[PDB]
Amino acid sequence: ATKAQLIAEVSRRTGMNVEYSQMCLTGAANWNLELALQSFEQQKANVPPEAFISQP
Amino acid sequence: SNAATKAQLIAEVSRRTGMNVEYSQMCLTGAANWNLELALQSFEQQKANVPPEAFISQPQV
Amino acid sequence: ATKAQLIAEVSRRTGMNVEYSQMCLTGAANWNLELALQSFEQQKANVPPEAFISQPQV
Amino acid sequence: SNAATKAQLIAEVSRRTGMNVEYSQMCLTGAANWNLELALQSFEQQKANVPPEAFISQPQV
Amino acid sequence: ATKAQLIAEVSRRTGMNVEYSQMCLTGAANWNLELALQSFEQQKANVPPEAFISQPQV
Amino acid sequence: SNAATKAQLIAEVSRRTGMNVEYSQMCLTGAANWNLELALQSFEQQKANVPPEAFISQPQV
Amino acid sequence: SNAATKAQLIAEVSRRTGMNVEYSQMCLTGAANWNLELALQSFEQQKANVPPEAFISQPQV
Amino acid sequence: ATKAQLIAEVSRRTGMNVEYSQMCLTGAANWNLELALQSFEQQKANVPPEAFISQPQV
């Protein structure tokens, strides 16, 4: 459904796999796409290489 | 979760077809029941009829 | 039949909300009512309780 | 696609008038331009002319 | 049998097919030809290209 | 409805004969009982009695 | 390095919410950015959507 | 699973603090939970009492 679409969208924009993409969406972002992507952009330096599958 | 597993399939359909995530999910849900091959087959049959605005990249297939 | 009436009819017959009803119609069913309903009938055991209640507004 | 939004308007008209999906859409399409209030007004004025088979639930406008 | 005539006339004037022509007549227009055509002219930009089976005729 | 189905037949008679929708319906109603071929046959025999003002397009039976 | 520090925060969320380690980490990652107060705040607001199977101890936020 | 999750899970299961839980995961276990737990069970007698900040669960 929309959760799956939202994870897929975060994965597409950021290049992170779905596991890490889901991490940005869960919690205080509460599946808000803008807040999830923002959190990634702010924390991008701290994301391990294994979490990345593609370029943004 | 199952959402994450479903998300991997949506992302793959989007990569291969060039469609955005909404339309990629459309191909998977329903009679394809998340069968990747059957979803891609549905795109092949319907691609000429997919709205132009629905595409974020060129179809790769 | 319009896309909107097909979604509404699937919603009526199955009891699912419009979001999940649309899911059955798009894709391999390609807006065929019988194939959408068949797919529901096959998958009904695995359909989430959330699919049967209306989605929160706004 | 705006189909889901339209489907919600059809469903609302059906609940209120008791009409099936086809006839509920008739009241919305055209001069009402999918305005719920105008659709319901049209039903009230033309209420006498809707065939009995078109009714799947209780009229409650 | 003026309903069939009215649907046929809207199709001819607008170039739209019969199904969608009927949509313009039913509802708030109450089968008034002018009001149906007004509704078409106002919504024409939003009518899908698929509905048009011919060029509009004065 | 049945109005829409009748309308596609009126439209076809109009296209073929050049008559407006009113006179096109005349050929279909009655003994032709909406049989397209019988309607066109009636036009061919009776064309001489249709007023010229009734014609809005090219005759092309 | 930072994994052990994160682990004590997960352990603390689990203790208070009753959620397993997977779902406890969910509240911490993302917009909370491992802020314990914001993670717990998020749980309190979203408890209804947490699957029952995710709970391995008593809720005591 | 993340390294942090794996440490937290070993801690929950064994009762060891996070520092000693991490010890079981790093090295030849290469962050495999089952081997970490196997190593704990085999070496449990040698773990100092101060390392245990809770009772073991499943």
Author numbering:
A (entry chain F): 600 to 655
B (entry chain E), D (entry chain C), F (entry chain A), G (entry chain G): 597 to 657
C (entry chain D), E (entry chain B), H (entry chain H): 600 to 657
Question: Which sentences from the paper describe this structure?
Answer:
The Mex67–Mtr2 complex (NXF1–NXT1 in metazoans and small bristles in Drosophila melanogastor) is the principal mRNA-export factor in Sacccharomyces cerevisiae. Mex67/NXF1 is a modular protein constructed from four domains: an RNA-recognition motif (RRM) domain, a leucine-rich repeat (LRR) domain, a nuclear transport factor 2-like (NTF2L) domain and an ubiquitin-associated (UBA) domain. Mtr2 is a ∼15–20 kDa protein that also has an NTF2-like fold and forms a tight heterodimeric complex with the Mex67 NTF2L domain.
The ctMex67UBA fold was based on three α-helices similar to those seen in H. sapiens and S. cerevisiae and there was a hydrophobic pocket in an equivalent position to where a FG nucleoporin peptide binds in the H. sapiens homologue, indicating that ctMex67UBA probably also interacts with FG nucleoporins in a similar fashion. The ctMex67 UBA domain contained a four-residue C-terminal extension compared with the H. sapiens homologue that formed interactions with the end of α1 in seven copies of the eight in the asymmetric unit and which might contribute to thermostability. The UBA domains and Mtr2/NXT1 showed a high level of structural conservation (Cα r.m.s.d. < 0.8 Å), whereas the NTF2L domain showed the greatest variation (Cα r.m.s.d. = 1.9 Å). The UBA domain showed the greatest conservation (29% sequence identity over 55 residues), whereas the RRM domain had the lowest (15% identity over 73 residues).
